[PDB]
Amino acid sequence: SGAIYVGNYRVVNRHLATHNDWANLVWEDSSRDLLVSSTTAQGCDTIARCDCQTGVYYCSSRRKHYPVSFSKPSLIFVEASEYYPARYQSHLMLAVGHSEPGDCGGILRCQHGVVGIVSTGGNGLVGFADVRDLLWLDE
Ligand SMILES: Cn1cc2c(n1)CCC[C@@H]2C(=O)N1CCC[C@H](C(N)=O)C1
Numbered sequence: 001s002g003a004i005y006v007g008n009y010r011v012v013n014r015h016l017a018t019h020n021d022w023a024n025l026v027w028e029d030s031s032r033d034l035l036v037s038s039t040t041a042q043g044c045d046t047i048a049r050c051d052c053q054t055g056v057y058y059c060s061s062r063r064k065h066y067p068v069s070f071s072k073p074s075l076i077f078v079e080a081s082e083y084y085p086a087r088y089q090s091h092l093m094l095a096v097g098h099s100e101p102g103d104c105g106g107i108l109r110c111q112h113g114v115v116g117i118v119s120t121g122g123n124g125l126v127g128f129a130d131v132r133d134l135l136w137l138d139e
């Protein structure tokens with residue numbers, strides 16, 4: 001689990017979205033595994049607007065933060081799951097690291113702020129859904 005809270009927006013993994021997230025839907029993209037819903041309270045997370053390829057992510061399955069080097073956002077093929085059939089997921093960055101399904105939602109941060117959230121894994125690689133291109137989260 002895990003979400004990004006900025007302004008009157010809440011960003012979650014689309015596969016983990018609640019009934020309330022869907023009832024207050026702002027935008028969703030199945031290909032990115034992202035869903036943004038509206039909130040009453042104001043959020044204070046700062047979104048990075050950069051092209052950093054190094055950062056730190058939170059891994060609940062180990063109760064630890066790990067420094068990582070990650071790839072640039074791209075179309076990477078993701079094996080079938082109970083949430084989606086086999087497809088290419090867009091805007092995805094990979095890093096050598098540990099992850100488990102329950103780690104989805106953990107934030108990846110660089111020195112500029114929030115970069116994205118944990119979204120895929122397997123084969124000793126962790127996938128992060130990038131959020132830096134969503135400039136509308138700040139206005
Ligand atoms: C963080 N994490 C996620 C996973 C693992 N860690 C390890 C096992 C694979 C699993 C995974 O890659 N998927 C299951 C959840 C939905 C994902 C998606 N966005 O399409 C695909």
Ligand SMILES: [Zn+2]
Nearest residue numbers: 050052110112
């Ligand atoms: Zn950065």
